[PDB]
Write a protein that binds this ligand. Structure first.
Ligand SMILES: O=C(C1=C(O)C(=O)N(c2ccc(O)c(C(=O)O)c2)[C@@H]1c1ccc2c(c1)COC2=O)c1ccccc1
Ligand SMILES: O=C(C1=C(O)C(=O)N(c2ccc(O)c(C(=O)O)c2)[C@@H]1c1ccc2c(c1)COC2=O)c1ccccc1
Ligand SMILES: [Mg+2]
Ligand SMILES: [Mg+2]
Lengths: 5, 226, 226, 5
């Protein structure tokens, strides 16, 4: 899954 | 409130005690109480709040996804019922935060971007589980919150700034996984990484390690999308 | 109770849904409700219960220890207060289990050893945080529960049996870390491992993998103690 | 810490 912060 | 008898400073301490014990529910509760003492939060304090609630919703999102994929494959009502129970619980935590933003938190530029990015993130988390009439009301909100934060960051922070960078990463992910707009999602991420390296001389000693990482994460996402 | 309207079988399903989502509080609650339907638990069902509550108390014990060592090093009252809050919470979960054992669970030999071992374990967990008059009442209890379970297992199960093996491992740890009796602690563990390999021909196809592991853990502890 | 199960 794509990275978020 | 249950934290209402405690001193703000003792609440900050215990939030930090909770983070060490990895008790993020407690951590979030302590920080919700500190916020409710009505004072501005410091940069260190903003990030105690964000880390605590992010760890909370993160476990819920992960449990929701486990159950939801079971519920997909399975199509007894017990799977639906348990999924809905974890869902309702997750929705409440997002409301608690969006309420905490829209009542005490939403100053200086980094401070305003920080909270507007949180608003867009937790609207996005609700979007992940919403459906129907009520749903699309949620998507537009995540988008306004993000856009406003983009506008501010683009004008007031250098393109190497961690808050500007991390916000854009998430706004990209929003385009991809939430608005079926891989075009915008990829454009933002590439532009963001590009503009940051164009002005790479603007990194500061205090945050350069963080900026390098968010740039690496922007290219991680880009590798994954192409 | 909150699970009182649900079917036992739907409670078992959701306990299993919760384990997959790693939602062990939910898991424990579901299994507490199933127990309270008043029927015997199957072997599979016993271990849904144990795994759920063990994961619950395990996180609490770990948080307690983090705070307690901070509290030791530190010798403001906030550390004591947060430690006591996590402590009280942990004590409640042990009471909930000890109550669940002393009211519905405490049949066949493996079944009786299973629950008596749980009784000794959760008395031991309370012993880890107790002090004073109230304290030593707790140590003797963990010991009776264990002893009775030892007596049964020694007579009714072969020395390769996982329940007999795992119980003895924990009873050893009890001697070491709770009764300041490294002598007995080491004796039990060595004897247990020895007697099991003496009659190694008694492993069964259904559980041999588990027995090998508890034997490896018995020797892991022994390496650590000498 | 010692192993328990
Ligand atoms: O934990 C991290 C950091 C610290 O806790 C911290 O204080 N940061 C930081 C640095 C400069 C700042 O100006 C501020 C601020 O104004 O509040 C915060 C990192 C960080 C925190 C949150 C976000 C980002 C960066 C980007 O978007 C975000 O939401 C972290 C670092 C890299 C990647 C992900 C997380
Ligand atoms: O998860 C494990 C297992 C299963 O869940 C399971 O069903 N087992 C099992 C095998 C034979 C049995 O007769 C029974 C029973 O009568 O209830 C249960 C393993 C197991 C569970 C709990 C304990 C032990 C063994 C020893 O003491 C214990 O408390 C596990 C395996 C190895 C080491 C640690 C844990
Ligand atoms: Mg942080
Ligand atoms: Mg198990």
């Amino acid at each position: 899954f794509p990275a978020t912060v | 409130g249950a934290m209402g008898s405690m001193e703000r400073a003792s609440l900050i301490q215990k939030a930090k005690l909770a983070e060490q014990a990895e008790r993020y529910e407690d951590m979030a509760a302590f920080m919700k109480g500190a916020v409710e003492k009505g004072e501005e939060l410091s940069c260190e304090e903003r990030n105690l709040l964000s880390v605590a609630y992010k760890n909370v919703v993160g476990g819920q999102r992960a449990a929701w996804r486990v159950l939801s994929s079971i519920e997909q494959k399975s199509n007894g009502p017990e799977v639906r019922e348990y999924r809905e129970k974890v869902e309702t619980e997750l929705q409440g935590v997002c409301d608690t935060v969006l309420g905490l933003l829209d009542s005490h938190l939403i100053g200086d530029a980094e401070s305003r971007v920080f909270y507007l990015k949180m608003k867009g993130d937790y609207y996005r988390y609700l979007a992940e589980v919403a459906t129907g009439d009520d749903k699309k009301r949620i998507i537009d909100s995540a988008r306004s919150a993000y856009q406003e934060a983009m506008d501010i960051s683009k004008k007031e922070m250098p393109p190497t700034n961690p808050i500007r960078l991390g916000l854009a990463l998430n706004f990209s992910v929003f385009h991809y996984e939430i608005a079926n707009s891989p075009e915008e999602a990829i454009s933002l991420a590439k532009t963001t990484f590009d503009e940051a390296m164009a002005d790479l001389h603007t990194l500061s000693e205090d945050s350069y390690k963080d900026s390098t990482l968010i740039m690496q994460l922007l290219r991680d996402n880009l590798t994954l999308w192409t």
